[PDB]
Amino acid sequence: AGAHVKYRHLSRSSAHRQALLRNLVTSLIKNETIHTTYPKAKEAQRLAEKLITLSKRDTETARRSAQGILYTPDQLLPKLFGEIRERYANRPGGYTRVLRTEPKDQYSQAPSAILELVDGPKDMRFAMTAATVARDREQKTESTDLTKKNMDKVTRFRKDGMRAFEDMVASLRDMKFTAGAINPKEWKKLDR
Amino acid sequence: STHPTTAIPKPTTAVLKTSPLAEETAVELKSPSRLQLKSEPGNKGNPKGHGDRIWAFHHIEQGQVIYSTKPVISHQHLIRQQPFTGKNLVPRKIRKDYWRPLAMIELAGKDQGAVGRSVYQKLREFKKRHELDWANEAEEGRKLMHKSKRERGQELNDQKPNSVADMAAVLAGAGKGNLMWQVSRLVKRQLRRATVYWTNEQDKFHAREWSDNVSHEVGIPGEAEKKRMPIRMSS
Amino acid sequence: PKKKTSHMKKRHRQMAGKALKDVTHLNRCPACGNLKRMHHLCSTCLGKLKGFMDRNG
Amino acid sequence: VTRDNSKQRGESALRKSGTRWKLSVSDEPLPEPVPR
Amino acid sequence: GPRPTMSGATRLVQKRRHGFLSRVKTKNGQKTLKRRLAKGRLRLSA
Amino acid sequence: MIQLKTMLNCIDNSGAALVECAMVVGQKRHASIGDRIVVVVQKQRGTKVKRGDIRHAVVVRTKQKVQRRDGSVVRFDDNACVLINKAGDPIGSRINGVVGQELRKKKWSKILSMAPMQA
RNA sequence: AUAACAGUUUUAUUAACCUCUGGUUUACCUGUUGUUUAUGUGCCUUAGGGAUGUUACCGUCACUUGAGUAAAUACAAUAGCAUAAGCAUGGCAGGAAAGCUAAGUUAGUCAAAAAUAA
RNA sequence: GACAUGAGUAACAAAAAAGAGUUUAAGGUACCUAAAAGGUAUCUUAGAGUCUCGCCUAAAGCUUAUGGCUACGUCAAGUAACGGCCUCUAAGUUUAUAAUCUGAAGAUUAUGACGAUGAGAAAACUUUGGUACCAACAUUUAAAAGUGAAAAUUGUGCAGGAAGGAUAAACCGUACCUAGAAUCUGAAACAAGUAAGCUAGUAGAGAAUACGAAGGCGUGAAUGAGAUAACAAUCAUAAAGGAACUCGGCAAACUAUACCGUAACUUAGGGAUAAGGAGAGCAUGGAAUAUUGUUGUACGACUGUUUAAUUAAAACAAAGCACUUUGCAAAAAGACGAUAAGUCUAAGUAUUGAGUGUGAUUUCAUGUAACGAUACAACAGCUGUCUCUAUGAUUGACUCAGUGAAAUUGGAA
RNA sequence: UCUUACUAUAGUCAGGACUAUAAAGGUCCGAACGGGUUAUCGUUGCAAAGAUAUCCGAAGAACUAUGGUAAGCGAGUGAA
Ligand SMILES: [K+]
Ligand SMILES: [K+]
Ligand SMILES: [Mg+2]
Ligand SMILES: [Mg+2]
Ligand SMILES: [Mg+2]
Ligand SMILES: [Mg+2]
Ligand SMILES: [Mg+2]
Ligand SMILES: [Mg+2]
Ligand SMILES: [Mg+2]
Ligand SMILES: [Mg+2]
Ligand SMILES: [Mg+2]
Ligand SMILES: [Mg+2]
Ligand SMILES: [Mg+2]
Ligand SMILES: [Mg+2]
Ligand SMILES: [Mg+2]
Ligand SMILES: [Mg+2]
Ligand SMILES: [Mg+2]
Ligand SMILES: [Mg+2]
Ligand SMILES: [Mg+2]
Ligand SMILES: [Mg+2]
Ligand SMILES: [Mg+2]
Ligand SMILES: [Mg+2]
Ligand SMILES: [Mg+2]
Ligand SMILES: [Mg+2]
Ligand SMILES: [Mg+2]
Ligand SMILES: [Mg+2]
Ligand SMILES: [Mg+2]
Ligand SMILES: [Mg+2]
Ligand SMILES: [Mg+2]
Ligand SMILES: [Mg+2]
Ligand SMILES: [Mg+2]
Ligand SMILES: [Mg+2]
Ligand SMILES: [Mg+2]
Ligand SMILES: [Mg+2]
Ligand SMILES: [Mg+2]
Ligand SMILES: [Mg+2]
Ligand SMILES: [Mg+2]
Ligand SMILES: [Mg+2]
Ligand SMILES: [Mg+2]
Ligand SMILES: [Mg+2]
Ligand SMILES: [Mg+2]
Ligand SMILES: [Mg+2]
Ligand SMILES: [Mg+2]
Ligand SMILES: [Mg+2]
Ligand SMILES: [Mg+2]
Ligand SMILES: [Mg+2]
Ligand SMILES: [Mg+2]
Ligand SMILES: [Mg+2]
Ligand SMILES: [Mg+2]
Ligand SMILES: [Mg+2]
Ligand SMILES: [Zn+2]
């Protein structure tokens, strides 16, 4: 009867919902990635992109508001205004990437996702795009336009850029990571 | 607020290497204290005889240790020396059929009780740092952090092997402000003589090495009268 | 209930429009070629790449 | 009164909290015994 | 309805009321024993 | 917004100090500034009106905010009124206070001829 | 004939709508009480001494404090202070846009015809 | 007895609460690899732990009882730091003996035995009756100070406060569980119930209220993830009005320190905290204290008791008062005894006991002070009771995954 | 072993206020504890008598623990 919801309530109390979002944003910085449900990964994505925006401000108020979101500031603030601030210095927003994944809990079959920091040590799209390039080179195939489009996304703002991407490809081929990969030319002849 | 230490090599004041982590030995971390550079420290403000001897009692089944200045422990010692290590793991009282004298330390100076009151302090400060701040056993040795909270509380109670290693350390000058050191400062220093009485000869082998100022004797005064015979290795 | 529901009127309620829908939004995975849901990450390559970034780095 | 009357504040053995204050034996490596 | 009439019950009052010695030692208790004994009861009391 | 059981102030020299509204005359909506009502005298001031006399009154002041056609919104600190007879002729002869400006458009020249102040 | 200015109903009901007037505001800003946690900082004196704090002992039937007796120390210190958060109805208090809303605004009834009754 | 229907529906909602990593064992899959193996990843089952968040906290913590369909390596001469067994006895029990009464069964009295919820030498080594007593209350006392016990000292009030004995180490208990997270009682894994000690600190008069150190927990998938309609429950706020609601102010809201001054009435104690004057920014700020107030009637003096689990009251009781009865010489009257001996009355004696009605006092049924979760009326305030509802919050309702009822049903297009 | 009365042996009642007392009161406010006034929910309930709030007593005719006695032709106990 009243207004629509401004955001997801996630079937929690007010205080319980503010702590759930501060914990996902704390694990995101500490671990560079988290595997949770999709509605949780989409609600923390807005709070993690606003916390990295405070890390790009030179005022003290931003340094005090960053302390009021994390749960171990003494141990995580140096990383926020250090490595992370330098990483996202030149990026105009969009510092997080939420990727849908198969259920993390098979009991409830609740749709899950992966919230990660772009251009990070655990960027799952930078590695999945490196595995595609690794297979293509190792099977004499031609990369698709979507692979070329993802290859530039994961190397435009990254510090090393292409050099760090070619090293990942080299490490995935010397390990034989693409062994047993179904060639893209035999996908139309497969049923199972 | 508490501050836990890390299992990192450090320098020792003792003459021996108490633990493999010890880097150096007999290092002066602070100028000698008032009573350290004193040939005859005295029983200034304590009863006659106090400090001449120190006893150690242990739970023969679980391994919990208690240090006492008198020949008998009371309900105070069990409360002020045994921290909470889990439900059903802190006894509610002292059961005479379980607690036995582990060892007894007697100093050469028959009236310098101030040296024993210092040895007693380092033993009680080392035991608190064994039940708490056990970072050297979290991932090595007993691996207390790889155990359940139930099994972790049982190993934290088994302070008998640790207590015998605190004796070889304290009686070798470990600690800062230990009065077992004797500095002449004419500047040569040495350790005061001591004697440890053991109810079990095999119990003195928990310390990897004992100092050269401690003499080991079997049998504690008053234990034979109780029809308790000492355990000898040679037999 | 006034009467017992017959085999006909109970079979209408149970199966008329309640047939399980076949999932048709399936695509292959670029890195390995295994079947996955559309717009979703491969579950066998996620774990393998997720574990490959934990050993060496 | 400036003293803290809760002597063992934030002090636990199961969780390896560490000593509340700095002792005279806190700068030395814990003596490791020979196991049973 | 039924009440929790056995809350706080002790097993000392169970032996004093329905025990074996409360029955062999009384004229009316010897009948209960013989009846339960003639029926085949294993639990003659308590 | 004046309803039944509402207590208002009498700002005319009629001898009434505190009246209670008993009926909104001619309408179902609650009386606002310039509306006719029937009140019951509850107090007096030390042919006056005795306590308990039922008379008609006009609302001149309302604590409820009133929006004019130009977007001006007026609010007073209390509800007041002036006692009138069923004819529409002020029982009193002089008003002591400020009345709302909505009496001008509702043809209350008689109340406005007693030189009341306006807001 | 122009130009400028001024004046041109009420009640009820139905629906829509938030420009206005208010109400609400549970992840907004500000102020603030009690208490806890983390981080930083933190007394005097000439690295030493002292104040506060710490550990052990002494002592009591037992517990706490003080003296006394030893030692360490802001290096991992006391009280205090700074920042931040938690809990106490969203802790409370003052405001508050959007959305929803009436008591608010606007509109129909309040344009019109045919065939009929007495 | 089996199998249907409701129905794959209700339910798994104590207003604590979860989040992201890590790891062990056994087993299922996919790839690697085709020498089996091993390796990488993943899932199932059964566990464990780390970091963060929150909840209880004079507990939902610890130590122990009653108890136990939880599990069997739980270890003592005694004290410090232990109970039972054992000795002694109370209320009582007695198919013990003696006497006595008695249709049988049995009952009475005395003695004996038995019977804890009580009393029991020593130990940090040990084996008469106030010259009183160990009920309640109060006071004092292990000498640096404070606090809590223990025991004793002194005292106070009346309601006048046990019994008896003394004074070289056997046998039995010892595990776990204490009810918010797997154990007791409630038919059960039940939002109920159950005994004792301890139960950080801050702040307080306090065991109030608030926070919470340690600890425990945030259930055995007996669930989890979404979404945030109607409606329901539990709440928050609210323009103007302020009981217009309603059988009825039901519910909700208001009500707010060692201070100056206090009435009628009164059993002279009270009424009485009467009333009336007052304690940097919007606020000296949260929680609790904290509740409508005042006045006047009816009934009952008062505090109490009552239909466990629909009636808490005007009913019962009550102190006070009145009346009848009881002289104790063998049985005082009264009550009890298939029915007696005999027991209570009572180790009492007409100011004793029993029975009956009344229900303090005042006036002799009636009028006041005081008191009431009694009934009723008025007055003031207060508020969503209402004009007239709106919005916000949580939990259900709704959808997905897991588990899976019931009343009901002659047969049904 | 519920419950009513009695009985023996024991325990418990934070703090404050008033009153003639240090202690003499079926005194006062209010926790523990004991009650169950009003409303709401619940009614195949968490519960075959519960939850929430509110309310009453809380040094007494009080409450609680472990035993004991008294019940079914007659009626045990009963502030009824
Ligand atoms: K007979
Ligand atoms: K009271
Ligand atoms: Mg839910
Ligand atoms: Mg809150
Ligand atoms: Mg035990
Ligand atoms: Mg019954
Ligand atoms: Mg009972
Ligand atoms: Mg007009
Ligand atoms: Mg609007
Ligand atoms: Mg707008
Ligand atoms: Mg904020
Ligand atoms: Mg907290
Ligand atoms: Mg709390
Ligand atoms: Mg506000
Ligand atoms: Mg608005
Ligand atoms: Mg028109
Ligand atoms: Mg016509
Ligand atoms: Mg249905
Ligand atoms: Mg339904
Ligand atoms: Mg459901
Ligand atoms: Mg496997
Ligand atoms: Mg409390
Ligand atoms: Mg059971
Ligand atoms: Mg024994
Ligand atoms: Mg006997
Ligand atoms: Mg006993
Ligand atoms: Mg329960
Ligand atoms: Mg409970
Ligand atoms: Mg049960
Ligand atoms: Mg527990
Ligand atoms: Mg959980
Ligand atoms: Mg209002
Ligand atoms: Mg208002
Ligand atoms: Mg009406
Ligand atoms: Mg009315
Ligand atoms: Mg009410
Ligand atoms: Mg009465
Ligand atoms: Mg009843
Ligand atoms: Mg009732
Ligand atoms: Mg009379
Ligand atoms: Mg007679
Ligand atoms: Mg009468
Ligand atoms: Mg009468
Ligand atoms: Mg009463
Ligand atoms: Mg389902
Ligand atoms: Mg009973
Ligand atoms: Mg009283
Ligand atoms: Mg009272
Ligand atoms: Mg009752
Ligand atoms: Mg219902
Ligand atoms: Zn793949």
Residue numbers in the entry:
A (entry chain L): 2 to 193
B (entry chain d): 33 to 218, 243 to 291
C (entry chain W): 66 to 122
D (entry chain T): 53 to 88
E (entry chain Y): 95 to 140
F (entry chain I): 1 to 46, 59 to 131
What do the authors report?
Protein synthesis in mitochondria supports bioenergetics of eukaryotic cells and is executed by dedicated mitoribosomes. To provide a representative reference for studying protein synthesis in the mitochondria of fungi, and to reveal how the mitoribosome functions in coordination with its translation partners, we determined structures of the translating mitoribosome from the representative fungal model organism Neurospora crassa.
Fitting the mtLSU model revealed an extra density that appears as a protein element forming a heterodimer with uL14m. Atp25 presents only in the class with the missing bL9m and unfolded interfacial rRNA that affects the L1 stalk. Atp25 bound to uL14m sterically obstructs the binding of the mtSSU by preventing the formation of bridge B8 with its globular domain. The steric block spans ~25 Å and would clash with h14 of rRNA and the N-terminus of mS26 of the mtSSU.
